Every structure is written in C-alpha cells, then in structure tokens.
Curated annotation (Swiss-Prot), chain A:
It comes from Staphylococcus aureus (strain NCTC 8325 / PS 47). It comes from the Bacteria. Autophosphorylated. Coiled coil: none annotated. Disruption phenotype: Deletion leads to impaired growth when the available carbon source is limited to glucose-6-phosphate. Deletion also alters antibiotic susceptibility. Member of the two-component regulatory system HptS/HptR that regulates genes involved in hexose phosphate transport system in response to changes in extracellular phosphate sources. May act as a sensor protein kinase which is autophosphorylated at a histidine residue and transfers its phosphate group to the conserved aspartic acid residue in the regulatory domain of HptS. In turn, HptS antagonizes CcpA-dependent transcription of a subset of CcpA-regulated genes involved in antibiotic susceptibility. This is Sensor protein kinase HptS. It is found in: Cell membrane.
Amino acid sequence: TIHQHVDESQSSLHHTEKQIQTFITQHNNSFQELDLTNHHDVTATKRELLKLIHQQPATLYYELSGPNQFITNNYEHLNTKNMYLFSTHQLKFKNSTYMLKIYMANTPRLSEIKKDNRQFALIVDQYDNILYANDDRFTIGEKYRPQQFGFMNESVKLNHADHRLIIYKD
Amino acid sequence: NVLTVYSPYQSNLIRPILNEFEKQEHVKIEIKHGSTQVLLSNLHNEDFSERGDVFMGGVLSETIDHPEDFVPYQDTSVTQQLEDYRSNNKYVTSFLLMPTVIVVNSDLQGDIKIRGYQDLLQPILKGKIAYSNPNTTTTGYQHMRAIYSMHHRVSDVHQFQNHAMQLSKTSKVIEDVAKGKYYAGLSYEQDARTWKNKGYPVSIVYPIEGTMLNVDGIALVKNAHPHPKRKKLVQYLTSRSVQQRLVAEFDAKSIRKDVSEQSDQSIENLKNIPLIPKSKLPDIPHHKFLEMIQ
C-alpha cells in the first residue's frame, strides 16, 4: 500500500542523509591532508566517495568541484537537473576548497513500487517546487498541484530539509 | 522589503549562494536576468522609484556607460583584495576574476598549432573559427580589446573579423566549437569547462600574445529607497568563505589575497597566465572603443 511505501522511503532517505553527514564529519581531518592536484590523493578521495555511494541503497552521483577541476561518478553525463539535490558541503582540502554535491537519481524502493505497483514519487519544497519525479507527467522545476490530476496520494516530511515526499497512484 | 539584484549570471549558478544570504539576513532576493548591456540599458531607462538595489556580476568597470546610475561605495575591507585588480572606480567593487580563453576542438585540431590570436589567422582556419558579437556581448568586446592590445591597431580587429565567423551569443561559440562546427572559438574559462565537463573534446588556451582577464564587479544601484541589506550582500559576496565557494563553482579566481593562489607551480596561480601588460590594456570608454572598431 501507499502508506507503507511512503514511510519506508522517508526512513531510508532519512538514514542515507545521516550517513552522508557522518561521512563528512569523520573525513574532515583526512580531507585537509589530501592535495587534489596530486593523483595519489585524488585516487584516495575517489575511493572514499565511491565507498560511500555504494553503502547507500539509492543511486547517488557525486560532483566534487574545485578551481578548474571536476570529479564525478556521473560517467554517462546524465543531466543533474533531473535529479534530486540531496546534500551540499563546502570542504577544505590541502590545496583549495572544493564543493561536494550529492544527487539522487533513483532508489531501489521507488523504482520497484513504480514498476510493480504503478506508485510514483514526487519531492517538493515548502514553496511547492518539484524537486524530483520518476513520472514524466510532471516536469522538474514546475509547481505541484494535487487536484489537476488528483490521484490517491500520501505525503511525509523529509528529515533533512523542508521537503515533502509524495507517493501517489491512479 | 524584497532585495532586488540585477545579474548577467545564469539563475541556477547564483541562486543557491544568494539563498544562504537570505537565511543569514532574513531577507528575500529577487533576481533580474539578461545580458550585461541589456541589464544596464534597462536600468538606465528605469525611474528612480522602480530600480533595484544591486548589480551583481559582469565587467562593470569596463562596460558601465552611465556612472550616474550607481552609488559610490568602497568597503573598508578593500585592503583584502589583490592590488592589481582593486577597482580604480568609485561605484564598482571588484568581485571575481575570469580569464578569457581560446577554446579548441581536440577532435578537429590535429597538428594545427593554436597558441594565441595570431595562430587563429592561419589560412587553414579561415572561416572555421568563431567569436561573439562585440557590440552586444562582453566576451566578444573583451576579446576585441585583447586583439587591439597586441599592437594598438584597429586593423588587427578588422583582419580577425574577416577571418572568424561572428555569432550573436557567447554561449553559441562554445557550443558550436564543442560540437565540431568550428575548429576554435573565443570564449571564457567557465563556459569552456562547462562543456568540457560533460565530455566534449575542448581544450583551453590562454592567448600567448596576451590574455584578457575579466574583472567582474558588484555595484550599488542609485534608487529612491535603498535596501538596508545591500551593503551586507556586497560584503557577503566578497567574504573569504563565499569567495572560496565561487572559485570552486565558477572556475574563477578570487579577488581576495588570502584566497588567491601563490604556490609557484600551479596553473591556477595568475602569474602562470600570460596576462596583457597593464600599460597596454585599452583605457577607452566602452562606447568609444566600439565606435573605434565599427
């Protein structure tokens, strides 16, 4: 049912965001020792980021951006605008400051309930902007309006920001 | 009261940073977008009562044709900025440094040498390179200044314009070079890396004859009721932590001394880029330099 699918995804997304923050906290001192102009330290950083990515259920892509430097596991160059921006961190490395953004493209739960149960997912802010959608009926960026299409839905508040996860079904 | 910002930067590049200022200062920031010259022109034709508060971004020290539209302001923390790029201009605060570049298609280049502007004049590249309209884009304007700075000859500009295709938009230059329509093009580092980062075969060249460095600025707009948070926004955008994020996201260089790069080896250090000598940089008003090359 929808209610049992909305609370599991909220709790899973709640847990994943915690693991990201914990990762950051525990890698603070290590990052300050890593010079990202040195290829050994770049490899060490990629190893830690890819380790974190695959410890999470969801499909996540990282973008580590610095001065004239771009490090990512988005090897197919998927458009991040169609993903959910899920954490942002300003990190001090040995050589410069880098911005780390983590995007959510899908989760094994949301992709399964969409295939098996035809239950789709939306993520909207308190301003009602669409921040994620696995349904083409809806367009990222535009506003959410439940009535127009009016499906049986159930929403919860996401833990890390003023966002709401909405799972619906026709 | 809503704080209104004019900005030639794309919305998605500055909105997250302005959102943090919104939370820090409990204010809402509305953004007006467009090219630098169009924003300036529409601002000049706005009454005193409907004008915004801050102009954020663009080569303001080189493009502002109406200084009476802006308020003189110099924060006391200007001593934290690089001396060579501190604004010599009462109504502009220097903000970010952006190198202009030649972008080269690495699939097409082969053995053709492209180190600067004079390599672009090779017969094998005639009609196969592109630039943006200097009358409507600051990128094309800055590149024509760099070409003019080579020998202080207007004829050098005209010879280049008889060799390279002129496009209406700066963004079309990098797009068409990256997609293989042109061998090379005149762009800027941030635009080049944007397409390089999504897999396109583009190389970045600092013109060896002299590399024009864009000094983007921030200016307070003269209006009837200035928003009291606007000076805090200028200080926020020029702060040390915000400049560190901007350098990482914009592929720019910081205006601050404590953020700038000084490690001798690295290319991100300004001293490793062949910049135009200060004595040669054209000190001509924006409207007059355009008149010279028309």
